[PDB]
């Protein structure tokens, strides 16, 4: 799993070297940024629901055809809406995981890998999840370097979907 610490260790092991001051100043950017990171993770975890709902509605208002069109991919049935809220929750939870680990590792390994194949197989439009992520980024209520972390990883997701 990609993290600053694992990236440093992998860097030192790839060339049969002990650790050096370089890797330690890296892990130091990690530990220092962990305060803002942790703050953002706590805040997002505390207001996860209100916001998965804000966001699901952002999607349904932006793309109304997804609440009326016939198809197992669309949210025109209770099961569809359930799947959608589920997936938005997955994205948010992944963001919190990245904030806790200090890197994109969790989102890379648990979500991004195989995303294109899934969206293509199940006829899921990226634009939907991009809209949800834009909503979350706009209404997570964070200020300062916490908002910088949250927005960093959310935008990472959006770029993965673009």
């Amino acid at each position: 799993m990609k993290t600053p610490i694992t990236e440093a260790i992998a860097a030192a092991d790839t060339q049969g070297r002990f650790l050096s001051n370089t890797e330690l100043q890296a892990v130091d950017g990690r530990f220092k940024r962990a305060v803002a990171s942790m703050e953002a993770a706590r805040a997002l975890t505390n207001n996860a629901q209100s916001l998965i709902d804000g966001a699901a509605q952002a999607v349904y208002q932006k793309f109304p055809y997804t609440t009326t069109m016939q198809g197992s991919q669309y949210a025109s049935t209770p099961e569809g809406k359930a799947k959608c809220a589920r997936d938005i929750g997955y994205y948010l939870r992944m963001v919190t995981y990245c904030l806790v680990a200090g890197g994109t590792g969790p989102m890379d390994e648990y979500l991004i890998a195989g995303l294109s194949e899934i969206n293509s197989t199940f006829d899921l439009s990226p634009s939907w999840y991009i809209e949800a992520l834009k909503y979350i980024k706009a209404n997570h209520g964070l200020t300062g370097q916490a908002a910088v972390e949250a927005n960093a990883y959310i935008d990472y997701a959006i770029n993965a979907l673009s």
Partner: protein, 172 residues
């Protein structure tokens, strides 16, 4: 390969849960204790060569049968391979110290190592001795209270000892 944070994240994902306040507190405490960790790594790494050398000398003094003709550590090639092995073990140990988790040590060093030494005929019990020496030395160096901001590092040293003992048990 995992670090402490990645470990908690994976355990939480297996259950499909957000982190709880207890976990956030635990990881925050890990962060607050990062300077001590970086110190330990810096020190052990800074004295790696003398750790391996002194540990080897002590080993061969205690078990001269290893360095006499017919022994496993006889000839320069096999001696070099032994010193090398010690360097590797200490190295992945330090990796684990920085990571706060034994995942990298296990997979990239300890996994399958008992089988290797059995096939080659190297006595894993002697390797274990070596690892114990390097352990005592490394802990002395890392917990040396001179030239550093005073404080309590007892919990970290028990973890380092945990990794060393883990290796020794893995080879013996």
């Amino acid at each position: 390969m995992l670090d402490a944070f990645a470990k908690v994240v994976a355990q939480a994902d297996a259950r499909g849960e957000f982190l709880t306040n207890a976990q956030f507190d635990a990881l925050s405490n890990l962060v607050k204790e990062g300077n001590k960790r970086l110190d330990a790594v810096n020190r052990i790494t800074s004295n790696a060569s003398t750790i391996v050398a002194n540990a080897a000398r002590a080993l061969f003094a205690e078990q001269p049968q290893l360095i006499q003709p017919g022994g496993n550590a006889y000839t320069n090639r096999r001696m070099a391979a032994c010193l090398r092995d010690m360097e590797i073990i200490l190295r992945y140990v330090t990796y684990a110290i920085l990571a706060g988790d034994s995942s990298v040590l296990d997979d990239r060093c300890l996994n399958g190592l008992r089988e290797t030494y059995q096939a080659l005929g190297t006595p894993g019990s002697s390797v274990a001795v070596a690892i114990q020496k390097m352990k005592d030395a490394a802990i002395a160096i890392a917990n040396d209270p001179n030239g550093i901001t005073p404080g309590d590092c007892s919990a970290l040293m028990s973890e380092i000892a945990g990794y060393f003992d883990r290796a020794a048990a893995a080879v013996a």
